[PDB]
Amino acid sequence: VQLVESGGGLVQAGGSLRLSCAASGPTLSNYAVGWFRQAPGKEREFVAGINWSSGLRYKDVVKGRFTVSRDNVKDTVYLQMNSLKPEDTAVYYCAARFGGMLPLQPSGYANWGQGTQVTVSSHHHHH
Amino acid sequence: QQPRPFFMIFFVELWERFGYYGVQGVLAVFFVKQLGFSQEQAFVTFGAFAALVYGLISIGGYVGDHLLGTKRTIVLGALVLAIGYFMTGMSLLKPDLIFIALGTIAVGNGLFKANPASLLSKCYPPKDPRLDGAFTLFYMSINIGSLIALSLAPVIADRFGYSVTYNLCGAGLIIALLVYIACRGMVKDIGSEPDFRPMSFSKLLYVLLGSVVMIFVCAWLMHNVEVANLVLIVLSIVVTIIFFRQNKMFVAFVLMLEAVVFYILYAQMPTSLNFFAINNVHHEILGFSINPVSFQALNPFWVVLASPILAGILSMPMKFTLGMFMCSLGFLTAAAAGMWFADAQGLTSPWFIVLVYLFQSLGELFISALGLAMIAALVMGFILGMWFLTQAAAFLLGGYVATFTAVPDNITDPLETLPVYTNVFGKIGLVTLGVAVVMLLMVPWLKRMIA
Ligand SMILES: CCCCCCCCCCCCO[C@@H]1O[C@H](CO)[C@@H](O[C@H]2O[C@H](CO)[C@@H](O)[C@H](O)[C@H]2O)[C@H](O)[C@H]1O
Ligand SMILES: CCCCCCCCCCCC
Ligand SMILES: CCCCCCCCCC
Ligand SMILES: CCCCCCCC
Ligand SMILES: CCCCCC
C-alpha cells in the first residue's frame, strides 16, 4: 500500500542505474508494478512495468535500454536503466495495481512511491 | 420476535457461509497465482469444484432425515468442513493436497447444507405466520456471512497469505460448531426422527466410508475435468431418457432448463466477472482503494438489502421470467460499460459493476430463492436427484463459458482484454434475453399447467 523506491542518482550519459520498488504490508507479488517518470514541466508518463505473472510493457523510447524484472523472494521489483541519456532525467515513481494489467495513465494505479530523482548529464571525459 | 433456536441457527449459518465464501472468493485467483494455472485451467477447475459442491447437496438431506438425524449431521458436516478448510491451509505446505482438500469441502458441504434450514423449520408450529420472515432472515444470514467473507478474505490473503485465510475459514467453522454445541439445549425436542434414537454406528460408518470415497472421487474429477464432462454428459442424457419415459412434471423440466441457464450465469461471478473487475475496472470507489476481488461481495450486499424490501412486495412462472430478464440486463450492462463507457486506457467506472451486481442479485432473488420450493409444489426423489445433477452440469458449463474470457498471462494492456470481455458478456446477455422472451411466451401455458 506504500512502496519505497530506491537507487536513483546522478550518472553520465551512457551509464547505468537500477531502481527498486519494495512494498510494506501487501505482498507485491499480486501486483503489476509500473514505473512512471516526470521530467521538468511535463506530466507523469508510463516508462515500464511487470504484471503479477511476468508480462512486460515498455515505452517505445526506452526499449532496448531499460529492463523491468521481479525478485519475488525479496518481494521487490527492479528497473535496470542502461545507456542512459540526458532526456531520461526525471523523477521516477513506482506504482502498483492489483492483477495482470499495466494501464498507461497514472489513474490506473492506486499505490504510489514517493519518487527518486534520476539525472543524466551530458558529461564526458576530456579528449 | 423469533424462537430462541432461530438465533442459534442464524449464527451457525452465518459462520459456515463465512468459511465457504472465504474460500470461494479467492479460489480462482489462488489457482492462477499460487498454483500457476492459466486462466482457462483455473476457470474450468473452478467449474468442476462448484459443480460437485452443488450436486452433493442432495446427500445431506437424506443423511439427516434417515440415517443419523438433523442435529448429528450438522455436527458431522461442520467437522468435515473445518477439516477441509485446514486441509486447504495445509495445501500450501503440501501442494499435492489441494484437490483432496477441495473434495473435503464439497463433501462436507454436501452433508451440512440442507440441515440447518430443516432444523429451523422445526422451530415453529406448522402454520406459524412467522415462518416466512424467519426464512428471509435465514437467507439474509447466509448473505451477511458471505458479504463479510467476500469483502475480507481477499484482503487477508493479500496481507497475510492463503494459509492464514484458509485457517480462518476453518476457525469460522469451529466457531459455528462451538455455538451449536453451546446452544444444544435449545433444540433438545427439535430434530428428525433419528435424532431421538441412539445413533446407529452401522449407518455412521456407512456415511464415513461413502464420504471418504466421495472425497477421492471429487479430487479425481476436479483434476480430470475432461472426464467430469463425459460423466455428467452421459448421466444427463441417461437421466433425461429416464425422465422422458416416466404433465405437471413437464413444467418441472422446462423450469429445470431455465434454472440451468440461470446457474451458467451465476457461475461467472467468481470467474469471468471477477477477472473483468481485475483487468478493466478502476480499483477505487467513493475515493477508497479496494482489492478488486472484493467486488464479488456486491452480490450478497444487494441480496442483504433487497430481500427484506422484496419480501414486503404472476406467481411462479412470471417470477422466473422476471429473474431471467434481470440477469440478461446485468450482462448487457457489463457489455455496454465496456463498449461505450471506458477510459482511453481501457478501464471502466466501478459503478457499472455495482449495477451489474444489482441486476444479477435481483435475478437471484426471483429465481434460486423461489425455485425448488415450488418445483416441490409441482411434484419426487428422482426429480430431486435430476435437479441437483443438472444444476451441477450448469456449473461445469459455466466454467466452460467463462474460459471464453480467459486472458494469457503475458497480456498487460486493458485495451486488449476489454473487447474480449465485452464480446462475451454481450453475447451472454443477448442469448439470455432470447431465453427470457421464450419464457415470457410460455408463462400462460405453464401457469395453466400449474392449475
Ligand atoms: C466493493 C466491496 C468493498 C470491500 C470492502 C473492503 C473491506 C475493508 C478492507 C479492510 C480494512 C481496509 O484495509 C485495507 O484498506 C485499503 C484502503 O481501504 C485497501 O487497499 C489496499 O489493499 C488491497 C488489497 O490488500 C489492494 O488491492 C489495494 O490497492 C491496496 O491499496 C484494502 O481494501 C484493505 O487492504
Ligand atoms: C455422539 C457419539 C460420538 C460418536 C463418535 C464415534 C466415531 C467412530 C469412529 C469410526 C472411525 C472410522
Ligand atoms: C493430511 C494429509 C497430507 C497429505 C499431503 C500429501 C502431499 C504429498 C507431497 C509429497
Ligand atoms: C450430536 C453429536 C453428533 C456426533 C457426530 C460425530 C461423528 C464423528
Ligand atoms: C445442456 C447443454 C449442453 C451443451 C454442451 C455443449
> Based on the number of CB atoms within 10 Å of its own CB, is B221 exposed (0-12), middle (13-18) or buried (19 or more)?
buried
**Count of residues in chain B:** 451
Cβ density class A102-123: b for 16+ within 10 Å, e for less: bbbbbebbbbbbebbebebeee
Distance CA B414, CA B408 (A): 12
Taking the CA atoms of residue B59, residue B63, residue B65 and residue B71 in that order, the dihedral angle to the nearest 10 degrees is -120
Measured on CA atoms in the order B236, B394, B15, B312, is the torsion positive or negative? negative
> How many angstroms away from the CA of B416 is the closest CA of chain A?
10
Residue A19, sorted as left (phi over 0), alpha (psi -120 to 50) or beta, turns out to be beta
* CA distances, A8 to each of A4, A70, A74, A81 (Å): 12, 18, 19, 10
Helix, strand, coil percent values for chain B (each to nearest 5): 80, 0, 15
What residue has cell string 550518472? A11
Breaks (C-N over 2.5 A) in chain B follow: 246, 313, 379
Give the residue whose CA is nearest to atom 3 of ligand 3.
B97
* CA distances, A64 to each of A20, A67, A79, B12, B52 (Å): 19, 8, 13, 59, 50
Distance CA B400, CA B384 (A): 25
C-alpha cell of residue B123: 422451530
β-strands A76-81, A17-23 pairing: antiparallel
Q: How far is the CA of B85 from the centre of ligand 1 (A)?
A: 24
What residue has cell string 464432462? B229
The crossing angle, in degrees rounded to 10, of helices B350-367 and B248-266 is 160
Is residue A100 a contact partner of residue B278, using CB atoms and an 8 Å limit?
yes
End-to-end alpha-carbon separation of chain A, Å? 49
Residues 6+ apart with CB under 8 A from B389: B55, B232, B235, B236, B239
Distance CA A101, CA B413 (A): 6
Residues 6+ apart with CB under 8 A from B419: B338
SS (H, E, C) chain A: CCEEEECCEEEECCCCEEEEEEECCCCHHHEEEEEEEECCCCCCEEEEEECCCCCEEECHHHCCCEEEEEECCCCEEEEEECCCCHHHCEEEEEEEEECCCCCCCHHHCCEECCCEEEEEECCCCCC
> How many angstroms away from the CA of A36 is the closest CA of chain B?
15
What residue has cell string 450486499? B301
Distance CA A44, CA B349 (A): 22
Which among A82, A80, A114 is positioned nearest to A95, based on CA atoms? A114
Q: How far is the CA of A20 from the centre of ligand 3 (A)?
A: 38
Distance CA B378, CA B315 (A): 13
Strand partners, B288: B285
> How many angstroms away from the CA of B34 is the closest CA of chain A?
10
Distance CA A33, CA A50 (A): 6
Taking CB atoms and an 8 Å limit, are A56 and B159 in contact across chains?
Answer: no
What residue has cell string 482484454? B417
Give the residue whose CA is nearest to atom 26 of ligand 1.
B291
Q: Which residues line ligand 1 (CB under 6 A)?
A: A 1, 26, 98, 110-111; B 151, 155, 158-159, 283, 288-291, 294-295, 297-298
> How many angstroms away from the CA of B126 is the closest CA of chain A?
52
Q: Where are the domains of chain B?
A: 1-451
Distance CA B414, CA B292 (A): 15
DSSP annotation string for B28-70: HHHHHHTS---HHHHHHHHHHHHHHHHHTHHHHHHIIIIIS-H
> Based on the number of CB atoms within 10 Å of its own CB, is B184 exposed (0-12), middle (13-18) or buried (19 or more)?
exposed
Indicate which technique resolved this structure.
X-ray
Taking CB atoms and an 8 Å limit, are B283 and A98 in contact across chains?
Answer: yes
What residue has cell string 473445518? B82
**Count of residues in chain A:** 127
> For the CA atoms of chain A, what is the radius of gyration?
14
> Based on the number of CB atoms within 10 Å of its own CB, is B313 exposed (0-12), middle (13-18) or buried (19 or more)?
exposed
For residue B271, the 8-state DSSP code is T
Minimum CA–CA partner of B284 in chain A:
A110
Distance CA B42, CA B363 (A): 26
Residues 6+ apart with CB under 8 A from B32: A53, B38, B39, B42, B409
Give the residue whose CA is nearest to atom 23 of ligand 1.
B291
User: For chain B, how long is the longest CA-to-CA vector?
Assistant: 69
Scanning B183-314, the segments in alpha helix (DSSP H) are: 201-223, 225-245, 248-266, 272-280, 298-312
Q: How far is the CA of B102 from the centre of ligand 3 (A)?
A: 13
C-alpha cell of residue B312: 414486503
Which residue, among B412, B413, B416, B420, would best test binding to A if mutated, counting the most A CBs under 10 Å from its CB? B412
> For the CA atoms of chain B, what is the radius of gyration?
21
Which among A106, A117, A99, A116 is positioned nearest to A21, based on CA atoms? A116
Taking the CA atoms of residue B21, residue B260, residue B309 and residue B276 in that order, the dihedral angle to the nearest 10 degrees is 50
Which among B49, B31, B27, B50 is positioned nearest to B41, based on CA atoms? B31
Is residue B112 a contact partner of residue B60, using CB atoms and an 8 Å limit?
yes
The crossing angle, in degrees rounded to 10, of helices B298-312 and B350-367 is 50
Distance CA B37, CA B106 (A): 21
DSSP annotation string for B206-239: HHHHHHHHHHHHHHHHHH-HHHHHHHHHHHHHHH
C-alpha cell of residue B267: 457461475
Which of B292, B345, B346 has the CB atom closest to A99's CB atom? B292
Count of alpha carbons within 13 angstroms of residue B428, beta-carbon side: 37
Is residue B425 a contact partner of residue B431, using CB atoms and an 8 Å limit?
no
Entry resolution (Å): 2.6
Taking CB atoms and an 8 Å limit, are A100 and B278 in contact across chains?
Answer: yes
Tell me the backbone φ, ψ of residue B411, rounded to 5 degrees. Answer: -75, 135
Count of alpha carbons within 13 angstroms of residue B93, beta-carbon side: 7
Strand partners, A21: A5, A77
Cβ under 8 Å to B: A residues 48-67:
49, 51-57
CATH of A3-121, one of 2.60.40.10, 3.40.50.2300, 3.40.1190.20, 1.10.10.60: 2.60.40.10
Is residue B388 a contact partner of residue B256, using CB atoms and an 8 Å limit?
no
Which of B161, B278, B346 has the CB atom closest to A99's CB atom? B278
